[PDB]
Ligand binder design. Structure first.
Ligand SMILES: CC(C)CCC[C@@H](C)[C@H]1CC[C@H]2[C@@H]3CC=C4C[C@@H](O)CC[C@]4(C)[C@H]3CC[C@]12C
Ligand SMILES: CC(C)CCC[C@@H](C)[C@H]1CC[C@H]2[C@@H]3CC=C4C[C@@H](O)CC[C@]4(C)[C@H]3CC[C@]12C
Lengths: 491, 166, 95
């Protein structure tokens, strides 16, 4: 456990700080056998390091997304697992918990590994070493294949599953491709199909609440009507506090998720803000302060815009929302910065001028900035102000501002939006798949007041007998597929 | 169009005041129906097919989001603007019409000093302008560009099928 | 005409519910000849199923747009038509 051996930033190379792990990680398929079959002092394959990793953990840590590195990692992983089958058949090397509490499959997901993780998720072996496999084939009748994928530690029925690690714990920039591979993709779609009624019931309840919000905010004073108004008032106080409690529970449960993915939620912050503003407005109304209506109407705007959360759940409109977000993030803040610099330079210049008399426009900085923004809209006034003999300077400044802003910046913004939308069309689908995944994982749990029963997804299949005694049964996931390509090579 | 024309002609006999709207709606629809006979030529028929595909794909999502923005901000502006320290934003229809005027290019963005909620109204109007005029319309142009680029290849075969049906 | 053999949504594989159609659809160019040239009990190539499809209908139903599937389907279609030319020249299997 040296500094040069520990995994950190700088001069380091982590390999598990064990001779067997070092031999396995360096593609030496000559001495690994001798490290176990030496009669004088055999080594234990299930040995662990100070950090808590084993040889398989060491192998998955060194994995990258490079093709050669993947070839090495899967080759050595399979070979070492096969060797472990022949040395200690009783104890399995697959289930060895780290000090963090992660198996090799979960470590492949948290660390952001995509090539070794995919192979572990779908691996097959021949008749010998059959039990140490994930994907099985039930029957190959004709050209239709029935694949059984093992759902060990990947279904959300357990406490810390792979699906909860990809969607909440992985902090890789491009984890959305991890939730699109076959096994997981057939599972998430089925879970989503099972959860359509709950999603749309939540949407309907929120829509009714927002309609009540609009009704109470509209029909309010500058009796029976007063009774209904008070009823709606208290009802919306309760609704706001309910939303606040739900969002607070979400953030308490995901305290370490905001740092990991801060632009992947951006709807829980908005919901929390809306609920907080509603509660504050309702409680502040009692103080009879004049700043009730602005808070109420700001909360109303935010609530009516929050339906874009429930926008996703459909194929096209959710991808549209994802593209909206990506356009907002990438090519809208640079343009805003440059445009604001231009605006607040020219406004100051016009305010400095225009007091040279040979109401008056460009009185203050706010008025000049507003006029220039009117130029941006399409309602700006470009007139030859003959009142003051600095006519030419004002006209030339206005024309230069128009040329630099209306012609350059907005049209170039349209061009940049076109480029961004063209570029991110491919990734837009996978990001929306990940959004469904997060929504489904939230929906498997109940609310902050009710606990939904865990509907264990999967089927118990006769996969054959374990290596010692009577048959071993594991919960698999069935998928039928038609493939003429792999059927021609079995006959 | 034919049903509306027949209904308008028969309803004229009843001397009901709702003859002219039916007649003029039928007239609009009939004059737009010539886009059927548009196809039959190489370029203009493919143009019509592209028009249809643009309408179907990237015009209903934008319409949905734009309507949500519009009818949120209109309600918010109607709720405000009665705080006197005709008056604009009287009803929901008037506020929605003003916001659509913003969409056109004829919207009025003025510093209403009549009522001391000046700042809130100005900030809501500016936020609506930023979210709609700058984001949504330009992004719509971008999406139309992407769709037209994508479906240029299939546009010819669809027009061939249209000739086949004709 | 079983549920697993009928073409529907779910667990199914339609092949014409006939032994000759099954042999033709599975790329077995060894037993199709024997299904017709057995002296004891020959089979009729123009046989039809309960739904009404024949062996050529069964072949075209299993066709997809995949290249390997197309290669199989056209190969067996041509071979079976050529065989039908040499067995019952009077009656055509196309119609
Ligand atoms: C509060 C009023 C006065 C000003 C507007 C501030 C709010 C509404 C702004 C700040 C950030 C903005 C959001 C940022 C993210 C997105 C992208 C997509 O998901 C739909 C629009 C949406 C959700 C925006 C809606 C408007 C928004 C929520
Ligand atoms: C009736 C008036 C008041 C409102 C307009 C409603 C009608 C005209 C709308 C509804 C659907 C629209 C049509 C939808 C399909 C197309 C695409 C292309 O083929 C030419 C335009 C055309 C034909 C549109 C013309 C206008 C249209 C026909």
């Amino acid at each position: 456990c040296g500094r040069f051996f520990q995994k950190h930033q700088g001069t380091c190379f982590y390999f598990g700080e064990l001779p067997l792990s070092l031999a396995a990680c360096t593609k030496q398929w000559d001495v690994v056998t001798y490290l176990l079959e030496n009669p004088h002092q055999p080594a234990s394959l299930e040995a662990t390091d100070s950090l808590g990793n084993t040889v398989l953990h060491a192998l998955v840590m060194i994995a990258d997304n490079s093709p050669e590195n993947s070839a090495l990692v899967i080759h050595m992983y399979d070979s070492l697992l096969q060797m472990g089958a022949r040395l200690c058949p009783t104890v399995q090397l697959e289930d060895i918990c780290n000090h963090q509490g992660l198996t090799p499959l979960k470590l492949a997901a948290k660390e952001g590994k995509i090539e070794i993780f995919r192979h572990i998720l779908q691996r097959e072996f021949s008749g010998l070493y059959q039990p140490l496999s994930r994907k099985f084939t039930e029957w190959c009748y004709g050209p239709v294949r029935v694949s059984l994928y093992d759902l060990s530690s990947v279904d959300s029925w357990e406490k810390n599953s792979v699906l909860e690690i990809i969607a909440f714990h992985c902090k890789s920039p491009h984890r959305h491709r991890m939730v699109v591979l076959e096994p997981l993709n057939k599972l998430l779609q089925e879970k989503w199909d099972r959860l359509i009624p709950r999603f749309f019931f939540n949407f309907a309840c929120y829509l009714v609440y927002m309609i009540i919000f609009t009704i109470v905010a509209y029909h309010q004073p500058s009796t029976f009507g007063d009774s209904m108004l008070l009823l709606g008032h208290i009802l919306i106080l309760l609704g706001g506090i309910y939303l606040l409690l739900g969002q607070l529970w979400y953030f308490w449960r995901r305290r370490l998720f905001i740092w990991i993915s801060f632009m992947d939620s951006y709807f829980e912050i908005l919901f929390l803000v809306q609920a907080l503003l509603t509660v504050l407005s309702q409680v502040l109304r009692f103080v009879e302060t004049e700043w009730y209506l602005p808070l109420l109407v700001s909360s109303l705007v935010l609530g009516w815009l929050n339906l874009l959360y429930y926008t996703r759940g459909f194929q096209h409109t959710g991808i549209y929302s994802v593209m909206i977000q990506k356009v907002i993030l990438r090519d809208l803040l640079r343009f805003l910065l440059v445009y604001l610099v231009f605006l607040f330079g020219f406004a100051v210049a016009l305010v400095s001028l225009s007091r040279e008399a040979r109401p008056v426009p460009y009185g203050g900085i706010l008025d000049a900035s507003l006029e220039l923004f009117k130029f941006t809209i399409g309602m700006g006034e470009l007139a030859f102000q003959e009142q003051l003999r600095f006519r030419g300077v004002v006209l030339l400044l206005l024309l230069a501002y128009v040329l630099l802003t209306y012609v350059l910046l907005l049209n170039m913004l349209i061009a940049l939006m076109s480029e961004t939308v063209n570029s991110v069309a491919t990734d837009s689908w996978s990001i929306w798949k990940l959004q469904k995944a997060i929504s489904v994982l939230e929906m498997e749990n109940g609310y902050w007041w009710c606990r939904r029963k865990r509907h264990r997804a999967g089927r118990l299949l006769k996969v054959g007998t374990k290596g010692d005694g009577i048959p071993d049964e594991r919960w698999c996931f069935r998928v039928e597929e038609v493939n003429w390509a792999a059927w021609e090579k079995t006959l």
